[PDB]
Design a protein around this ligand. Structure first.
Ligand SMILES: *[C@@H]1O[C@H](CO)[C@@H](O)[C@H](O)[C@H]1NC(C)=O
Ligand SMILES: *[C@@H]1O[C@H](CO)[C@@H](O)[C@H](O)[C@H]1NC(C)=O
Ligand SMILES: *[C@@H]1O[C@H](CO)[C@@H](O)[C@H](O)[C@H]1NC(C)=O
Ligand SMILES: *[C@@H]1O[C@H](CO)[C@@H](O)[C@H](O)[C@H]1NC(C)=O
Ligand SMILES: *[C@@H]1O[C@H](CO)[C@@H](O)[C@H](O)[C@H]1NC(C)=O
Lengths: 50, 49, 172, 44, 99
């Protein structure tokens, strides 16, 4: 199929109309960030010759 | 798959290391990929080539 | 298409797989870059049919229904201002220019209809004059400054947009 | 087959037709049966 | 930068080769429409909110805070006056309580 970018909704804009929230939500999300990689060392002489 | 980024980093490192190890067993145009075999089968000149 | 060369390459190792893997990773991360940059919002907001934004004129940046890929005037100017075998293939991007234009239009509509409220949750409509008053208060200038200089500020914004149009059109 | 290492008794099971035994990297690991282990080495 | 929504706080956690941030954010919900006015004409002077917006439910005008519907009677304490209201585009008539 052709991927959809998301639900298409038109905001009820008017020059004298505002929308205020009456409630809230405490949302806890997780962000995962790599910080290091395995520290590898190679003995060049042994690897090439052995 | 919630830790996809970390798992991907680990996979890249491991795959690169494994590719190196596998490349350690290629002829590159030599008679054999085993240095001991070349040394035991050939005399100095062609051994070194 | 050389069997002898292919046989010679076989016994040379696995460099071909490494190179192909690197190029594939590059392409995947390019698609990821485009997605991360342009796909901030997952709702395609639409600008209203009546455009009464307190005197501000965004027609130069909003999509034109003429369907030139449904890109704004400045977007068309930018696209027209950039001048673009042996196993070498060019892969198409995951997101087409039309979809990227849709994303940018959604971002524009959200910004001009609801301000920053659409990035913290559900878009909240607000008159554009009041949104600009919010922003003026944000930079440390009271609201009355805007509400008393609304016409002047709208004219200055329109003139600036026109100047950007001219600079992108003529100046190289 | 020339090599250098330590020969040890092996718990692996070689079928009667098998002579050498290779682990990953295609380096000989056992020979008819004795396991081969590289002599202790490392960095300093 | 620290999660979608208005960032409140975050907690770090370790991982094998990285970190995991638990971002606690505030996300508004349960929207409701209102009619707004940039300012208020009272005694021939324009009043603007000190901090908040002027809203009306159907008939009455309150001054609430932007991110949470907490309406309050318009007063000289929560509004500031700036000149007459012949220049503001879209000002509305109402009474400003004097406490
Ligand atoms: C806000 O939502 C909670 C549940 O998420 C509900 O218990 C509470 O009554 C709501 N408050 C209002 C004012 O709607
Ligand atoms: C109230 O706002 C919603 C969107 O926030 C809109 O769909 C609806 O039309 C508005 N109310 C009226 C009476 O138009
Ligand atoms: C608006 O609010 C005021 C005070 O809270 C109330 O007296 C009035 O009935 C409300 N009107 C509507 C239409 O809700
Ligand atoms: C809003 O627009 C309507 C026409 O759609 C107009 O009658 C009204 O005066 C305008 N109000 C403001 C505050 O711009
Ligand atoms: C507000 O009141 C003044 C006089 O008190 C009047 O001239 C003006 O027309 C009123 N505003 C509106 C929108 O009716």
């Amino acid at each position: 199929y052709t991927m959809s970018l998301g639900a298409e909704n038109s905001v009820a804009y008017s020059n004298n109309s505002i929308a205020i929230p009456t409630n809230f939500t405490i949302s806890v999300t997780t962000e995962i960030l790599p910080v290091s990689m395995t520290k590898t060392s190679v003995d060049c002489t042994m690897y090439i010759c052995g | 798959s919630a830790l996809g980024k970390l798992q991907d980093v680990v996979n890249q490192n491991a795959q690169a290391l494994n590719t190196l190890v596998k490349q350690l067993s290629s002829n590159f145009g030599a008679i054999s990929s085993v240095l001991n075999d070349i040394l035991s089968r050939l005399d100095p000149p062609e051994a070194e080539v | 298409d050389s069997t002898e060369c292919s046989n010679l390459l076989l016994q040379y190792g696995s460099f071909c797989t490494q190179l192909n893997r690197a190029l594939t990773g590059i392409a995947v991360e390019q698609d990821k870059n485009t997605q991360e940059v342009f796909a901030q919002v997952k709702q395609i907001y639409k600008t209203p049919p009546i455009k009464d934004f307190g005197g501000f004129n965004f027609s130069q940046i909003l999509p034109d229904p003429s369907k030139p890929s449904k890109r704004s005037f400045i977007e068309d100017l930018l696209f027209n201002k950039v001048t673009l075998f042996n196993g070498l293939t060019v892969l198409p991007p995951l997101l087409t220019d039309e979809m990227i234009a849709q994303y940018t239009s959604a971002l524009l509509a959200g910004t001009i209809t609801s301000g920053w409220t659409f990035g913290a949750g559900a878009a909240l409509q607000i008159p554009f004059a009041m949104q600009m008053a919010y922003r003026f208060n944000g930079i440390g200038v009271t609201q009355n400054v805007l509400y008393e200089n609304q016409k002047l500020i709208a004219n200055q914004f329109n003139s600036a947009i026109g100047k950007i149009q001219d600079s992108l059109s003529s100046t190289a | 087959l020339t090599g250098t290492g330590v020969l040890t008794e092996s718990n692996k099971k070689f079928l009667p037709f098998q002579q050498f035994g290779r682990d990953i990297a295609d380096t000989t690991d056992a020979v008819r049966i004795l396991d081969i282990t590289p002599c202790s080495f490392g960095g300093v | 930068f620290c999660g979608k929504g208005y960032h409140l706080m975050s907690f770090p956690q370790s991982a094998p080769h990285g970190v995991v941030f638990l971002h606690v954010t505030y996300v508004p919900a349960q929207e409701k429409n209102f009619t707004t006015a940039p300012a208020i004409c009272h005694d021939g002077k324009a009043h603007f909110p000190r901090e908040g917006v002027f809203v009306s439910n159907g008939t009455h005008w309150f001054v609430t805070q932007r991110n949470f519907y907490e309406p309050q009677i318009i007063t000289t304490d929560n509004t500031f006056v700036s000149g007459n209201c012949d220049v503001v585009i879209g000002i509305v008539n109402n009474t400003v309580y004097d406490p």
